[PDB]
Amino acid sequence: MNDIVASTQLPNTIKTITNDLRKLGLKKGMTVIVHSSLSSIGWISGGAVAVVEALMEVITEEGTIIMPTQSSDLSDPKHWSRPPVPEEWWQIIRDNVPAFEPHITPTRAMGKVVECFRTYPNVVRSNHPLGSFAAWGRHAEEITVNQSLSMSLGEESPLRKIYDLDGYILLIGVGYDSNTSVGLSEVRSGACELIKVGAPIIENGERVWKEFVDMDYDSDKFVEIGVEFEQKGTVTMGKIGNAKCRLMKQRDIVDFGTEWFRKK
C-alpha cells in the first residue's frame, strides 16, 4: 500500500480512469470482457468500486461488461496441484464442500475488481460451479444464461456468446495468462485432454456432487500465443494510471489461438 502510494503522482479516480478508458478505445454500447489487477493502476480513490463505476460509466447499460467469476475451490481435489492435499481428504471434501450458489460463492484468483463487480445490483452470474462468468448491461442475460456443465469454456459458454457479438477483451495490468477467452481457442483446436471432473451443485434445492467432463485447460501457452499474436499489430495499448493495458477484438485472438494450437 505504501509503495502504490509512492509510485503515484496524483490519485486515480472514477473521472481519470474514465478518460483513460475512452482514450484507449472503450466506448458506449460496446461488449467487453475485462481482466484486471487493481494495484497495477496505482493508488485509486475508491479502489475496486471506482474501477467498476468507470467501466459502467463508459460502456453504459446499452453496452455489456463481462468478467470471469471462477471458483476452483469447489473442484475435485484429485487434480489439485497449485496447493495439493492428502488422498484421505479427497472423499471428505467431495461429501462436505458447500454447493455453488451464484449470489453466495466467492471467486478465487479473480481479484477485488471481480469480487466487487459480481455483487453489484443488476449484475447477473452464470450457472457454472467452477467456470462461471458475471455480466452487466444490454446482453447480460443472453451471455450468462444456459451455460453447459461439461465444456465450461466451449461453444455453449459465455465465451462463444461474446464471440458472436463480436466483442472485445480488455486487459488492465495483466497479460495473456489471464485472458480466459483463449480457452475457447483450446476447445476449438482440441489442445488439451479431456478429464472426468466434479463439483457440488444445488439439484432440487438439494446439495449434489455432480461428475461431468471438461478439458484440462492450460494457460501455460497463452503468454506465448499473445506475444506472437501481437506481432500483427491489432492490439491497442495504453495506460490506465500506471497500468499497461490492452484492447483487442475477442474474435481476433480466439481465431489466432485456434490456428496457433493446430499448427503444433
Ligand X SMILES: CC(=O)SCCNC(=O)CCNC(=O)[C@H](O)C(C)(C)COP(=O)(O)OP(=O)(O)OC[C@H]1O[C@@H](n2cnc3c(N)ncnc32)[C@H](O)[C@@H]1OP(=O)(O)O
Q: What residues make contact with its own copies under the rule CB under 8 A?
A: 1-2, 5, 10-11, 13-15, 43, 45-50, 53, 73-74, 82-85, 88-89, 92-93, 96-98, 103-106, 112, 115-116, 119-121
Grid coordinates representing 35 are 481482466
Q: Which of 198, 183, 196, 157 is nearest to 74 (CA)?
A: 198
Task: Give the residue ranges of DSSP H helices in 105-182.
Answer: 112-119, 140-144, 158-164
The answer to whether residue 130 forms part of the interface with ligand X (CB under 6 A) is no
Nearer to its own copies, 56 or 254 (CB): 56
Q: Smallest distance, Å, CB 82 to its own copies?
A: 8
- CB under 6 A: which stretch of 37-45, 58-66, 140-148, 200-208 binds ligand X? 37-45
- Cβ-based nearer residue to its own copies, 129 or 154: 129
Least Cβ distance, residue 41 to its own copies (angstroms): 14
Cα–Cα distance measured from residue 35 to residue 33, given in angstroms and rounded to the nearest whole number: 7
180 interacts with, out of its own copies, Cl ion, ligand X, none, CB within 5 to 8 A per kind: ligand X
Listed in order, strand segments (DSSP E) in the chain are 31-36, 64-68, 124-125, 133-137, 168-172, 194-202, 207-215, 236-240, 243-249
Length of the chain: 264
- How far apart (Å, rounded) are the C-alpha atoms in residues 188 and 182? 10
Question: In whole angstroms, how close is the CB of 130 to its own copies at the nearest point?
Answer: 14
> Judged by CB under 6 A, does residue 68 bind ligand X?
yes
Question: Binds 121, which of ligand X, its own copies, Cl ion, none (CB < 5 to 8 A, cut-off by type)?
Answer: its own copies
Strands 31-36 and 64-68: parallel
Is residue 180 near ligand X by the rule CB under 6 A?
A: yes
Task: Kindly determine how many residues on this chain lie close enough to bind ligand X according to the rule CB under 6 A.
Answer: 22
DSSP label at 36? E
In eight-state DSSP terms, residue 121 is T
The residue numbers preceding gaps of C to N over 2.5 A in the chain are none
Sign of the alpha-carbon torsion through 157, 161, 162, 166: positive
* Spatial CA neighbour of 158 closest among 173, 170, 148, 172: 148
Q: Would you say 39 is a known binding-site residue?
A: yes
Binding partner at 109 among Cl ion, its own copies, ligand X, none, C-beta below 5 to 8 Å by kind: ligand X
Of the candidate spans 14-22, 29-37, 224-232, 244-252, the one that interacts with ligand X by CB under 6 A turns out to be 29-37
Does 70 appear as a known binding residue? Answer: yes
Binding site for acetyl-CoA: which residues? Answer: 35-39, 44, 70, 109, 112, 178, 180
